[PDB]
Every structure is written in C-alpha cells, then in structure tokens.
PDB file of C-alpha atoms and ligand atoms in Angstrom:
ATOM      1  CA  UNK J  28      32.602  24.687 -12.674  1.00 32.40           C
ATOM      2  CA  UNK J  29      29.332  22.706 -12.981  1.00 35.54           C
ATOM      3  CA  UNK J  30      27.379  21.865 -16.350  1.00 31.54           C
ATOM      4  CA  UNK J  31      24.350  19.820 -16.966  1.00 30.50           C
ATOM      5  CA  UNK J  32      22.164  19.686 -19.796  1.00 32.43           C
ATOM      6  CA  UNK J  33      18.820  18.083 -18.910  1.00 33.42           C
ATOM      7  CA  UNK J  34      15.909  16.422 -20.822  1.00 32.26           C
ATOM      8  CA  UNK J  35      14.429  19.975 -21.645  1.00 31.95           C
ATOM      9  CA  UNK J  36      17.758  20.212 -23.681  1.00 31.26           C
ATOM     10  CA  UNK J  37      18.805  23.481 -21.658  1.00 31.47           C
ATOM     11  CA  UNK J  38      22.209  23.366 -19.961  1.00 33.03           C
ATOM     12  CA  UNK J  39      22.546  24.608 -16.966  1.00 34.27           C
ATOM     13  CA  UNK J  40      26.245  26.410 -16.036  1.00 32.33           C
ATOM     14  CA  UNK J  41      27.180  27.171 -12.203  1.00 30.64           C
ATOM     15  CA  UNK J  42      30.536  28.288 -11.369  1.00 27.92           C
ATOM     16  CA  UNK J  43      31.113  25.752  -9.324  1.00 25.19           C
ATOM     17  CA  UNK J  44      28.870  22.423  -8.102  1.00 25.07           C
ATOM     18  CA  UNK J  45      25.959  23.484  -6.282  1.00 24.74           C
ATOM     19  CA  UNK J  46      25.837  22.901  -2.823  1.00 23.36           C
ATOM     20  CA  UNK J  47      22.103  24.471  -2.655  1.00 20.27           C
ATOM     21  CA  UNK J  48      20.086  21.754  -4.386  1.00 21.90           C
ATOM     22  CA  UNK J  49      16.541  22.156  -3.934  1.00 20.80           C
ATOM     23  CA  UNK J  50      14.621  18.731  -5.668  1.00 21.62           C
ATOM     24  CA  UNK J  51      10.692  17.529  -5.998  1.00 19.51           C
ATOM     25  CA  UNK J  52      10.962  14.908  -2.794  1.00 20.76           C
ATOM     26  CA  UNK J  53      11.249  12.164  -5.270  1.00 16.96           C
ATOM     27  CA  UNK J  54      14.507  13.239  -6.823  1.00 20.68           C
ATOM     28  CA  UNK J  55      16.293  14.533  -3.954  1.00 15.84           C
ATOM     29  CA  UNK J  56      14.947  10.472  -3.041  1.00 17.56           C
ATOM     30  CA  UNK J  57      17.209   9.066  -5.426  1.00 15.99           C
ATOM     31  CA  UNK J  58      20.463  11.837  -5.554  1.00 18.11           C
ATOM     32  CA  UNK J  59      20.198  10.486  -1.914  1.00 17.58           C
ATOM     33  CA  UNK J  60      20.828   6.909  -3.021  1.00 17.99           C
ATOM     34  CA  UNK J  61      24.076   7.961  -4.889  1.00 20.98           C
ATOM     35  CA  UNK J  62      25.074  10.206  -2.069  1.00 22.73           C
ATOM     36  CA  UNK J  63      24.165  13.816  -3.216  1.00 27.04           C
ATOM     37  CA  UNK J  64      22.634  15.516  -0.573  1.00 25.23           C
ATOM     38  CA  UNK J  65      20.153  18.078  -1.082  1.00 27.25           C
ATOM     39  CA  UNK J  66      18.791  21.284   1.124  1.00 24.32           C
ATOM     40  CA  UNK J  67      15.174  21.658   0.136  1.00 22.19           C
ATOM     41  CA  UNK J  68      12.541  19.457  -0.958  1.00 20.30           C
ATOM     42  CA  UNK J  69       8.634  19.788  -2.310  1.00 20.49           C
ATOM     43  CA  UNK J  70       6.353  17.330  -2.534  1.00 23.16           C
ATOM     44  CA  UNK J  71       4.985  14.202  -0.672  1.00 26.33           C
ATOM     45  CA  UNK J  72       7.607  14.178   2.188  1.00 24.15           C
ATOM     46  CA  UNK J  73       5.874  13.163   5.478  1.00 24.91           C
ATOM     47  CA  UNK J  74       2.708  11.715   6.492  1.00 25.11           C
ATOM     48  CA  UNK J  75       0.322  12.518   8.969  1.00 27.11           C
ATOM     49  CA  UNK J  76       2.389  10.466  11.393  1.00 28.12           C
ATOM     50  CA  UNK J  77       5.444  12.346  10.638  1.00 28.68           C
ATOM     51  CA  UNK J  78       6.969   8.843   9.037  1.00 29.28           C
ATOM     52  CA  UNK J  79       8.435   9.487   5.392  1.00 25.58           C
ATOM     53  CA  UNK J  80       6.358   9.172   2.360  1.00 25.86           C
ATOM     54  CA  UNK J  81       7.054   6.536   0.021  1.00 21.96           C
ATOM     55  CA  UNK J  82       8.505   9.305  -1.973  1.00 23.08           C
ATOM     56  CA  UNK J  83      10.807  10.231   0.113  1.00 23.60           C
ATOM     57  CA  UNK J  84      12.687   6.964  -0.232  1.00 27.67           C
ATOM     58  CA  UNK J  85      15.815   7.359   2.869  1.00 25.99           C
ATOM     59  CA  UNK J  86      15.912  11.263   3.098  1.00 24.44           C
ATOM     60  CA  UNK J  87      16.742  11.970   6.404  1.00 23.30           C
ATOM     61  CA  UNK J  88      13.250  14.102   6.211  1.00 23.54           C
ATOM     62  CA  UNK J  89      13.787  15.579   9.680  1.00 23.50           C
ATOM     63  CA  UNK J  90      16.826  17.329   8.604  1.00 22.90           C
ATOM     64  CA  UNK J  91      16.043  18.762   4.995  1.00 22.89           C
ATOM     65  CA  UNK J  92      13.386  21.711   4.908  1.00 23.95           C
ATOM     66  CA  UNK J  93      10.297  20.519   3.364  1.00 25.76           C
ATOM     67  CA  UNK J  94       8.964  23.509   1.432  1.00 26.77           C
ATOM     68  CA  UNK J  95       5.521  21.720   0.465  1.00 26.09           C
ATOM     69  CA  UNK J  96       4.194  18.629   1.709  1.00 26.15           C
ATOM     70  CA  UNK J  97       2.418  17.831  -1.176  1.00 27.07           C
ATOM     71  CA  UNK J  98       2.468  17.858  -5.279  1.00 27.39           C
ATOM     72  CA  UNK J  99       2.337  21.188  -6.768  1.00 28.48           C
ATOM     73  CA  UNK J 100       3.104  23.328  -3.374  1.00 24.27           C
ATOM     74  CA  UNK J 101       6.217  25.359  -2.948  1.00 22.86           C
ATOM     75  CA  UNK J 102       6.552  28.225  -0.851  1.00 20.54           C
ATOM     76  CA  UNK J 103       8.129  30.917  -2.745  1.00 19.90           C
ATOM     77  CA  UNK J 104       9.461  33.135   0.449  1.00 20.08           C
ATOM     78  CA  UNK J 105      10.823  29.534   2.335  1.00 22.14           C
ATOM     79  CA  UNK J 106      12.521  28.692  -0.872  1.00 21.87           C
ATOM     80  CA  UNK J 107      14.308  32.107  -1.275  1.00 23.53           C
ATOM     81  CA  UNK J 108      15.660  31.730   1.792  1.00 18.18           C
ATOM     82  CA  UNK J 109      17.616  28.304   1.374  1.00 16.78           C
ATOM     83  CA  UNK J 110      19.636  30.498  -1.300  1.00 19.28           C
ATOM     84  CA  UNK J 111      18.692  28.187  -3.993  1.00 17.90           C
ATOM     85  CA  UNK J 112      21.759  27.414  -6.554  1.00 17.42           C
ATOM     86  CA  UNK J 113      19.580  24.800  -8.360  1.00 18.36           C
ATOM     87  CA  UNK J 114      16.051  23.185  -9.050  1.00 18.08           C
ATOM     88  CA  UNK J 115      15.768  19.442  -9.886  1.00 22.18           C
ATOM     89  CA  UNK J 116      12.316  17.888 -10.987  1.00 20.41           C
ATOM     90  CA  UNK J 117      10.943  15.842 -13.199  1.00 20.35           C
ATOM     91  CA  UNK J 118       8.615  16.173 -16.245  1.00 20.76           C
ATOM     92  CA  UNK J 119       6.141  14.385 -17.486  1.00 20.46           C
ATOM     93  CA  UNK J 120       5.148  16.383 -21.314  1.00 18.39           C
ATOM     94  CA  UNK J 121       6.646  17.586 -24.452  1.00 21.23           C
ATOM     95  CA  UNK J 122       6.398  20.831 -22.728  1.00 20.16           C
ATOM     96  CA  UNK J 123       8.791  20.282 -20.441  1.00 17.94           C
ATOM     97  CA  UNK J 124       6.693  21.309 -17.539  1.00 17.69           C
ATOM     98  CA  UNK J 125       8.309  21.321 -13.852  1.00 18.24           C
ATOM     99  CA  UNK J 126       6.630  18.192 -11.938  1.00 13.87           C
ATOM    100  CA  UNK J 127       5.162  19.971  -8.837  1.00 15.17           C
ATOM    101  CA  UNK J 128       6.619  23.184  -9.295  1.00 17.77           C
ATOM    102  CA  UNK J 129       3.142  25.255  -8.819  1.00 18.62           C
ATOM    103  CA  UNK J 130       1.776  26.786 -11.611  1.00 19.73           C
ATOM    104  CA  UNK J 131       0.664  29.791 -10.295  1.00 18.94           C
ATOM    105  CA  UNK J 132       4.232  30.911  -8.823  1.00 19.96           C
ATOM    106  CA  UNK J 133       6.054  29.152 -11.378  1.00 17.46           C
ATOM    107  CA  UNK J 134       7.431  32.454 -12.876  1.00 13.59           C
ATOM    108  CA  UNK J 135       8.516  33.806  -9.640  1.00 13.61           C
ATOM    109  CA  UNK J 136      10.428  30.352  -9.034  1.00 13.27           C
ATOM    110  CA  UNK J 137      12.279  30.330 -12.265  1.00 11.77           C
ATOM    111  CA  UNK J 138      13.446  33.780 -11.421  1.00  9.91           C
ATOM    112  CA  UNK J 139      15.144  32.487  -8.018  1.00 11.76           C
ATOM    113  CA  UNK J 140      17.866  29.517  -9.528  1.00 11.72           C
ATOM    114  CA  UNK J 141      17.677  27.344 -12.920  1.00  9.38           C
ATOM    115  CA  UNK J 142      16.344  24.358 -13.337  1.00  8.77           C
ATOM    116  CA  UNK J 143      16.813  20.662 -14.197  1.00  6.01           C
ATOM    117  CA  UNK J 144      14.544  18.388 -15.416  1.00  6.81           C
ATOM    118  CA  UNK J 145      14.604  14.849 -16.036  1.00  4.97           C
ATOM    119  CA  UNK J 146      11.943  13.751 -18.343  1.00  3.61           C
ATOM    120  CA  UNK J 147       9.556  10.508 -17.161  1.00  2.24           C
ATOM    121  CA  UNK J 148       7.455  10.983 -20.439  1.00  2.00           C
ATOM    122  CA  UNK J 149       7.016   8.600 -22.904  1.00  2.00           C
ATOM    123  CA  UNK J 150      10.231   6.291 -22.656  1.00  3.19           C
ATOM    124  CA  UNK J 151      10.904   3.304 -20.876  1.00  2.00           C
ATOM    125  CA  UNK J 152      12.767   3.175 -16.972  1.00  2.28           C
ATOM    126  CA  UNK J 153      15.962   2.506 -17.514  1.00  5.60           C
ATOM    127  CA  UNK J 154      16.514   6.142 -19.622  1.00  7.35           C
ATOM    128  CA  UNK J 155      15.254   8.132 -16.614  1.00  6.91           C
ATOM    129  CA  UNK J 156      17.615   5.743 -14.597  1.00  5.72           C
ATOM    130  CA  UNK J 157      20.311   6.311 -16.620  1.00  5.42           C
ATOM    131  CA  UNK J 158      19.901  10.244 -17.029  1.00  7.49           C
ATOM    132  CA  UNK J 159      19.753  10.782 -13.222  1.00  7.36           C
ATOM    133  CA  UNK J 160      22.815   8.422 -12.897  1.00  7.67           C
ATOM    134  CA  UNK J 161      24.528  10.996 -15.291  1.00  7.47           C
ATOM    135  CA  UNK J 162      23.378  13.919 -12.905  1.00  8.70           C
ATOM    136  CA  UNK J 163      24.406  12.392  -9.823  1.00  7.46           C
ATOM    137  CA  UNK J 164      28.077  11.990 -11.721  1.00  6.46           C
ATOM    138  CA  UNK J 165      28.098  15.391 -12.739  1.00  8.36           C
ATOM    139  CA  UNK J 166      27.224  16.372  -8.870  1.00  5.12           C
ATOM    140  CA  UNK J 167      30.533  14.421  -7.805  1.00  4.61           C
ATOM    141  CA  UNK J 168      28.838  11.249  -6.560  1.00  3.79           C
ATOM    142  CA  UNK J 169      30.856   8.600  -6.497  1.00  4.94           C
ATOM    143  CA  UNK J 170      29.549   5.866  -8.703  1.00  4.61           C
ATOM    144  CA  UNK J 171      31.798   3.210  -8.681  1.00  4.62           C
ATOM    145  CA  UNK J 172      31.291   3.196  -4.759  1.00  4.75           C
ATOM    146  CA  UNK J 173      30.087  -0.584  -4.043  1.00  6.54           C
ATOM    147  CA  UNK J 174      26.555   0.573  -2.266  1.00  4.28           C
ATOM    148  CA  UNK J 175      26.255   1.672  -5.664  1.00  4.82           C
ATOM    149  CA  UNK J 176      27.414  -0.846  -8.206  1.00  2.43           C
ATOM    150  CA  UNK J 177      25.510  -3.234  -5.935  1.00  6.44           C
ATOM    151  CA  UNK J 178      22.282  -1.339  -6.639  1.00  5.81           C
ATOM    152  CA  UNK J 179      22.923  -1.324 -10.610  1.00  3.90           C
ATOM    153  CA  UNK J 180      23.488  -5.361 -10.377  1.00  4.70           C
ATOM    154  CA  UNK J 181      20.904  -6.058  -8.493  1.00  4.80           C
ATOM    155  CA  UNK J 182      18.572  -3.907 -10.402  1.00  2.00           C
ATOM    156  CA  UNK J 183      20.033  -5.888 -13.514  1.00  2.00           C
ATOM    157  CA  UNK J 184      19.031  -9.317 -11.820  1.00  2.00           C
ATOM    158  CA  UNK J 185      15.472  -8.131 -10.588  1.00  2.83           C
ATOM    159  CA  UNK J 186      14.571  -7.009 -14.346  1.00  2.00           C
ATOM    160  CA  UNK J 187      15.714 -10.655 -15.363  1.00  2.00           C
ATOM    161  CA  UNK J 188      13.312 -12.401 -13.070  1.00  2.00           C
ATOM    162  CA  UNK J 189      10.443 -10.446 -13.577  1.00  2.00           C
ATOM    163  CA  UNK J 190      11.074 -11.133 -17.705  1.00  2.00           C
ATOM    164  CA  UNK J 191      10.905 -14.848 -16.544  1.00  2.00           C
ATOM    165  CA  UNK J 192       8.096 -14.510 -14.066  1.00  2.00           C
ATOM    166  CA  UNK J 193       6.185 -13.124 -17.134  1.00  2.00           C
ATOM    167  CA  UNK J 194       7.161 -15.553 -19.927  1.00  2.00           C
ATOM    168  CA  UNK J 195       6.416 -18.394 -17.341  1.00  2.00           C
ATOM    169  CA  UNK J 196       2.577 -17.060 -16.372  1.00  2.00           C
ATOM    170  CA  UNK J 197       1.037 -15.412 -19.774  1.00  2.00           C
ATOM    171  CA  UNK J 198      -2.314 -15.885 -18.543  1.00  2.00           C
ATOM    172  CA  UNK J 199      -1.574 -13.899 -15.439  1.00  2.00           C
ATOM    173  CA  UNK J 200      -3.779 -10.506 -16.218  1.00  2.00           C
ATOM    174  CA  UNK J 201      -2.089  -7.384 -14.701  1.00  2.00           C
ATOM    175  CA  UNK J 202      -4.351  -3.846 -13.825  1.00  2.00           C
ATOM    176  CA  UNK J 203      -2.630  -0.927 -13.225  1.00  2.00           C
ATOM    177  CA  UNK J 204      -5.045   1.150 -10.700  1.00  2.00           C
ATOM    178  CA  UNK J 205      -5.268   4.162  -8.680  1.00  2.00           C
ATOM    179  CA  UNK J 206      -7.899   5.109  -6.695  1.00  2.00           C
ATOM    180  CA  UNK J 207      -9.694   8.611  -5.814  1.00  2.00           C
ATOM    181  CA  UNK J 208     -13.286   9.325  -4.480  1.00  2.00           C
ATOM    182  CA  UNK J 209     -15.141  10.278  -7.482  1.00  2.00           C
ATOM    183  CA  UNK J 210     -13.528   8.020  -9.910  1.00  2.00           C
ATOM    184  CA  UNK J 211     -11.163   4.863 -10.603  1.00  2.00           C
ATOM    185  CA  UNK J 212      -8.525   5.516 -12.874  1.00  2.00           C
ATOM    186  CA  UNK J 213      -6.603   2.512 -15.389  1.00  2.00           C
ATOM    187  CA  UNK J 214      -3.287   3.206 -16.685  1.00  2.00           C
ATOM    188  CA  UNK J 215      -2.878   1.965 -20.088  1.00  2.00           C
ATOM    189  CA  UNK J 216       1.234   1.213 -20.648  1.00  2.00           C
ATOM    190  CA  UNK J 217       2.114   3.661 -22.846  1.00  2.00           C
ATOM    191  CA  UNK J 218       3.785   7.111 -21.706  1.00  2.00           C
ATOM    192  CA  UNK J 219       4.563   5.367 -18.223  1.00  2.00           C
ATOM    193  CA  UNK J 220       7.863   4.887 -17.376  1.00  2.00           C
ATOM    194  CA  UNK J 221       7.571   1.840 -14.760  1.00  2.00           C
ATOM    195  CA  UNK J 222       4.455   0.429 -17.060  1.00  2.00           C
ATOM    196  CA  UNK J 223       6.914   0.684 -20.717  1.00  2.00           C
ATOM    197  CA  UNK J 224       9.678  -0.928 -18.715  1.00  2.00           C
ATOM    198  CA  UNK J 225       7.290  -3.733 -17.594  1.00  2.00           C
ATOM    199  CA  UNK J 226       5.421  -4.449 -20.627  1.00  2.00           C
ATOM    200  CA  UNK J 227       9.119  -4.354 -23.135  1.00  2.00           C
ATOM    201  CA  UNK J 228       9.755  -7.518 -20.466  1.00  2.00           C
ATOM    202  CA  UNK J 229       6.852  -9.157 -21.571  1.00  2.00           C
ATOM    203  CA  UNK J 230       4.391  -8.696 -18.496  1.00  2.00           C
ATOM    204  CA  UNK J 231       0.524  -9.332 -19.518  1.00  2.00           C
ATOM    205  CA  UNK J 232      -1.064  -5.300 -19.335  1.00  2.00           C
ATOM    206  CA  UNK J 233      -5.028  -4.943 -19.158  1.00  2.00           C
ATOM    207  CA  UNK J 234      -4.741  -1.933 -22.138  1.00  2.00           C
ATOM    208  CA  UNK J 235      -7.754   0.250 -21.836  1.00  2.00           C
ATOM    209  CA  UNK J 236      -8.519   1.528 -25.364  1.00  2.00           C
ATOM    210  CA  UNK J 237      -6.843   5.005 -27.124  1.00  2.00           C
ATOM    211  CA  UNK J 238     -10.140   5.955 -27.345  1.00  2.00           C
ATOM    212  CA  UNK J 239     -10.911   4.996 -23.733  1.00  2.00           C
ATOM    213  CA  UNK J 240      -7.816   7.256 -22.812  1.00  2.00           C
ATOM    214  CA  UNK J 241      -7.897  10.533 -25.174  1.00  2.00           C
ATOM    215  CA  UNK J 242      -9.591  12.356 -22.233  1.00  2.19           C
ATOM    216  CA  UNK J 243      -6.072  12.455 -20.522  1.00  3.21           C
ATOM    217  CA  UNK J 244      -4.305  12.474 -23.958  1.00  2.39           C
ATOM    218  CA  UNK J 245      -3.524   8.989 -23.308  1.00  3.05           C
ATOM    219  CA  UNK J 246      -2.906   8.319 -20.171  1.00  4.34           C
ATOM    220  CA  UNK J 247      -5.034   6.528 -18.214  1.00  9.08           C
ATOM    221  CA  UNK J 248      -9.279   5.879 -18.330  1.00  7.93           C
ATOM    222  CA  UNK J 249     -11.311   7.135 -15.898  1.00  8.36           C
ATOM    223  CA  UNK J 250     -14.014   4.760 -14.082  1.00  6.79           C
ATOM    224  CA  UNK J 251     -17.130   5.135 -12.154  1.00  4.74           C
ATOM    225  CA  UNK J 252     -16.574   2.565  -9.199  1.00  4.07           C
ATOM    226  CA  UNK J 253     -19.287   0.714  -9.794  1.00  4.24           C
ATOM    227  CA  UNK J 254     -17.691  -0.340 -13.237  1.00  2.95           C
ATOM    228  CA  UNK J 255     -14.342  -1.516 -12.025  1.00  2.65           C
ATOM    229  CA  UNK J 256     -14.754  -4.445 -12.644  1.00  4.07           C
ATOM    230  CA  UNK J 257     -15.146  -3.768 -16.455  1.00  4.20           C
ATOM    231  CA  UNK J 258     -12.122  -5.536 -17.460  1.00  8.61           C
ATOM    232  CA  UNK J 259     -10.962  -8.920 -15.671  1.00  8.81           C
ATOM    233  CA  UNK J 260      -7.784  -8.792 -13.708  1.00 12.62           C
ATOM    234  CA  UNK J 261      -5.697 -11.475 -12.202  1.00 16.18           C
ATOM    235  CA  UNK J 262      -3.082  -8.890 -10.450  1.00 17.48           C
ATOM    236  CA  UNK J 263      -4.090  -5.498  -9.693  1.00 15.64           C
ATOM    237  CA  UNK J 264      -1.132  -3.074  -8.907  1.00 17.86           C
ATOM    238  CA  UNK J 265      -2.352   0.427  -7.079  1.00 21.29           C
ATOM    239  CA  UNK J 266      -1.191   3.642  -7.249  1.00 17.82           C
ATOM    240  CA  UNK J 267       0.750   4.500  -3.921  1.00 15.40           C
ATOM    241  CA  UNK J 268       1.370   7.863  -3.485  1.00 17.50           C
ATOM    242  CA  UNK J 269      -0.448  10.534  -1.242  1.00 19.61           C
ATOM    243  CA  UNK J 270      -3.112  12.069  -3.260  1.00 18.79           C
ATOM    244  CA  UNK J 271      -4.502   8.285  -3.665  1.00 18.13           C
ATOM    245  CA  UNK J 272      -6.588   6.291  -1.586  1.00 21.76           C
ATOM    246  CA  UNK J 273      -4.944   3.367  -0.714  1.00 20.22           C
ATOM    247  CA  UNK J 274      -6.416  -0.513  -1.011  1.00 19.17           C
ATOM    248  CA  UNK J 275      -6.791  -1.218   2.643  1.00 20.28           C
ATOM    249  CA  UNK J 276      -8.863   2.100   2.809  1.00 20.35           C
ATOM    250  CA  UNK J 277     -11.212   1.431  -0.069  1.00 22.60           C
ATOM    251  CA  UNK J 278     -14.545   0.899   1.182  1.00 24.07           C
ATOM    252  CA  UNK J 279     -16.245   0.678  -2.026  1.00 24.60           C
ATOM    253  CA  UNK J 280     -18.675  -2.918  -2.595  1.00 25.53           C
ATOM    254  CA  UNK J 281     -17.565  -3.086  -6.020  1.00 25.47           C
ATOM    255  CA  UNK J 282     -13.585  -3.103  -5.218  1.00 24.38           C
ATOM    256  CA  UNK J 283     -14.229  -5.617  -2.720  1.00 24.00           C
ATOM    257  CA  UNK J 284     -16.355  -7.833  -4.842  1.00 22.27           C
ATOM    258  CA  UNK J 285     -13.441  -7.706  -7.526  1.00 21.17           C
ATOM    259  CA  UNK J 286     -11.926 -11.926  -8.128  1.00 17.78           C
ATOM    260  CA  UNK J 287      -8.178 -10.438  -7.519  1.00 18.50           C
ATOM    261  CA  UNK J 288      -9.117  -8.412  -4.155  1.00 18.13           C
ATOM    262  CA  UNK J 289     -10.786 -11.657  -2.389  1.00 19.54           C
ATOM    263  CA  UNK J 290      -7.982 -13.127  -3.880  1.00 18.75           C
ATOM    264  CA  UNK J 291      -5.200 -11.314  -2.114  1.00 19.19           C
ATOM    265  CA  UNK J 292      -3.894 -10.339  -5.246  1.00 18.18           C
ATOM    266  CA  UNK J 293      -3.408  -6.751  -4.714  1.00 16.33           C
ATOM    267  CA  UNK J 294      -0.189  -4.968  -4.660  1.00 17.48           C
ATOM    268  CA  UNK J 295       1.448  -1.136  -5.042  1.00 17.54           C
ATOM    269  CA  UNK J 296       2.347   0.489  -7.707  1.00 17.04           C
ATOM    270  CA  UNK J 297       4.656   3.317  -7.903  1.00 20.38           C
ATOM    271  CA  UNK J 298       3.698   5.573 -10.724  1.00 18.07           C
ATOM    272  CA  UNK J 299       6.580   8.166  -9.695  1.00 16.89           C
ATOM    273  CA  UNK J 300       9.769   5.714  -9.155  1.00 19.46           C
ATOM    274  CA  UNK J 301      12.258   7.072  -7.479  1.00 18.62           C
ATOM    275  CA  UNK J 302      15.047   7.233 -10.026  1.00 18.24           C
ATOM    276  CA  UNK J 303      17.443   5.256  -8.399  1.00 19.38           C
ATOM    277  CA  UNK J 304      18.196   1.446  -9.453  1.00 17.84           C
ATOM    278  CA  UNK J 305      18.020   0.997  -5.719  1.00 20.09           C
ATOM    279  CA  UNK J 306      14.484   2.215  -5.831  1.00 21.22           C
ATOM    280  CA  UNK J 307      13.377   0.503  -8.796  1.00 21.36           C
ATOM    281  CA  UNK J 308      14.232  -2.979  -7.804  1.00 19.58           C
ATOM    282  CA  UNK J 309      11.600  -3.574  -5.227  1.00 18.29           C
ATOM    283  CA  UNK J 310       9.358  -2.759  -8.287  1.00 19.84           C
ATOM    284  CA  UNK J 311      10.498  -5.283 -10.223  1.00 20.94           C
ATOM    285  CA  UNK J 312      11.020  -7.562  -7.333  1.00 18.70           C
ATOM    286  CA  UNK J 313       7.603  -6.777  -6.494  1.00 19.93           C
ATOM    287  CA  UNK J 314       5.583  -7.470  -9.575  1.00 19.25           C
ATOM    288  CA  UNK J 315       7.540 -10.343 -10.482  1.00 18.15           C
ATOM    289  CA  UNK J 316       6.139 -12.307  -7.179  1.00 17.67           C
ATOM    290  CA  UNK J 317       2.601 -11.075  -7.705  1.00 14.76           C
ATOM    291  CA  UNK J 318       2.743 -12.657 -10.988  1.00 14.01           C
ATOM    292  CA  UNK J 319       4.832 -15.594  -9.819  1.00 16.11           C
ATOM    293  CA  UNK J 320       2.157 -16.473  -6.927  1.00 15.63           C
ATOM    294  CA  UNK J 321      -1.380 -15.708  -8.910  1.00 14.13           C
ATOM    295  CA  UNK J 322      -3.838 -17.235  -9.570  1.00 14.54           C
ATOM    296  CA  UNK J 323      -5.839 -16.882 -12.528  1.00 18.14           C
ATOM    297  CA  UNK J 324      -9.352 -15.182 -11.036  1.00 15.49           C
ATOM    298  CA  UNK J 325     -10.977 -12.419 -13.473  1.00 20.05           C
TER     299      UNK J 325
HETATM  300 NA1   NA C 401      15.243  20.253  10.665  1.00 19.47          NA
HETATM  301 NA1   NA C 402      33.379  12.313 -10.981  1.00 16.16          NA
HETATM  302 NA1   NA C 403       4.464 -19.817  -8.044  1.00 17.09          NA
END
C-alpha cells in the first residue's frame, strides 16, 4: 500500500506503489535522479533536434512517452492509454493549480488517476527539495544510496560558496531576466523558489517595485525592450526554458547595448529547477562564479 499527502494537503492512497507514474517533464527529471522511473511525461521534453530539454534533466527521453512537448499540453486519449496510476506536477498558487496540466481538459484528466502536487510557490528551494525527497522515499527510492547522499552533500557545499561568493562581492548587481518577443520580463525575488533561496544567502537582487509587479500579482515586471536597461545590472541571469528566447538569439539593439552583455556577464537561469539536489547544484555553482568573476558594469 502507497500513501502520499502532497502540498495541496490531499493524500493520495493506492493499493500498492504505482508503477504507472505519469509526471510534468520536470518532475519525472528529478524522481529520475533518485531512481524512480516514470512512464509518461508532459512538458518541455525534446527540442527541435531531438536532444533533451533542459527540463528533462537525464530522462532517457527516447524511452518514456512524451504526451506534450510543451507547457500546458497533454493528450487526454495518449494518456489513457499508459493506464495512469498517478499524476505528479508541480504548483505554483494558493490554488493549488496542476503546473501544465491543460486547463481546458483538466477535468477529464483528474477523472483518469489522482494527483500529486508539490508546491514551488512562495517558499524558499530547499522545501520543494525536501518534499520531493519525501516522495521519492515513499516511491521506494533508495536514499541512502551514495549517488544520492553525494548529491545532498554536494548540494550542501555549493549553497556554502555561493553565500561566500555573495558576502565577498556586495556590489555585484544581479537581474533575473527572461526574454519573449513583445516584452522583457524581471523577476523580483519573492514567490520564486531558486530567487528566495538565493537572496536568504545574501546574493545582491535588482527588486523591481510591488507596484511594478501587481500586474502578475507579484511576480515579475513586464518591459518594453527598449527600456531594459531601466535598472543597472552587473550579472544578468536568463530564463532558460523553451517558451523563452534565449541570449545568444536576442537580436534586440537595446540587449546588446546593455554594460553586463558586452561584458560577458550573462548566464541561465532556471526558473523551474528540477527538484533534485543534483539539479540544483549547478545553480548554485553557477551563480556563485558569475558573481565571483564580475565586474561591476551597470
Ligand atoms: Na520509445
Ligand atoms: Na523505503
Ligand atoms: Na574573482
């Protein structure tokens, strides 16, 4: 018998641990990394090459069916047929809403297995972390395997030297970005998980204004592109997932024009981690060497 009660505070109660998993690309990412394997994915899962998305993290992507290739697609009939015991997503609102889960067929999902959600609202990393660490254990991973201690430690250490990267550079000026063709969007900190994480260890956060933000209810500000460079940035971390246009790929004067993109000073975000400490640590990793390495430039 299996039992899980998510971040939704529904439990979930199978007769026995589901070997039908079907998970948002991102989570089946990281039950991967603690060596649950899953039978159906949705989301960003290949790209136009046929390589993995960054999303998919080491899925064997070839051998899982991909239901939808993209957020919020799911093909009700393809999903049926996988005889789903189980639906794992995230959630990003009070609400509880399933990440990606479309809205439209929603209903006729819910109808075909429960669900789980893990909650990457308003909190800081390491709960998400911990609360798909719990659901991998519940699953019958084996966490005290070494791939898998090694991941937590080395998670641990990463954390630690991007709190000292931070508290040795205060002047270094970090923009959280994501680009789109109509409009440049800033993440303020709050209601991230990655951005929470980064800012409780001290890292330097351009903070667009609450009012700036209360078209998205807080989340981010959105910019025409020839404004970008309304506040001055030393580090500029972008958005890396599939419905984003990418740095190399912006062709905008004003981007290019910006002191931290002639500076090299450019790096990815990911605003979905993978919930995996083994995921997360190139993002700490990652940051902390932008911000050991920059210059001051905005
Ligand atoms: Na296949
Ligand atoms: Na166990
Ligand atoms: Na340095």
């Amino acid at each position: 018998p299996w039992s899980f009660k998510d971040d939704r505070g529904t439990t979930v109660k199978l007769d026995k641990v589901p070997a039908n998993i079907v998970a948002f690309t991102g989570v089946a990412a990281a039950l991967f990394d603690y060596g649950v394997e899953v039978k159906g994915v949705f989301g960003p899962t290949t790209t136009k090459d046929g390589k993995p998305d960054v999303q998919a993290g080491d899925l064997d992507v070839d051998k899982v069916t991909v239901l939808g290739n993209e957020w919020g697609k799911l093909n009700v009939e393809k999903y049926a047929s996988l005889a789903p015991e189980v639906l794992i997503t995230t959630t990003f609102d009070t609400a509880g809403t399933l990440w990606s889960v479309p809205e439209e067929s929603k209903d006729k999902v819910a109808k075909l297995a429960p669900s789980v959600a893990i909650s990457v609202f308003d909190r800081q990393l390491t709960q998400p972390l911990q609360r798909m660490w719990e659901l991998a254990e519940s699953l019958g991973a084996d966490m005290k395997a070494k791939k898998v201690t090694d991941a937590k430690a080395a998670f641990d250490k990463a954390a630690a030297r991007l709190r000292a990267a931070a508290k040795a550079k205060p002047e270094i000026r970090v923009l959280a970005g994501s680009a789109s063709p109509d409009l440049f969007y800033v993440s303020g900190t709050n209601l991230s998980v990655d951005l929470e994480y980064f800012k409780a260890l001290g890292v330097n956060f351009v903070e667009p204004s609450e009012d700036a933000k209360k078209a998205t209810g807080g989340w981010f500000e959105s910019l025409s592109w020839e404004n970008v460079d309304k506040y001055p940035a030393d580090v500029i971390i972008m958005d890396d997932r599939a419905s984003t246009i990418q740095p190399a790929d912006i062709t905008e004067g004003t981007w290019k024009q910006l002191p931290a993109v002639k500076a090299g000073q450019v790096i990815a975000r990911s605003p979905e981690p993978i919930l995996s400490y083994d995921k997360c640590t190139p993002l700490l990793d990652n940051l902390a060497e932008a911000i050991e390495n920059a210059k001051k430039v905005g």
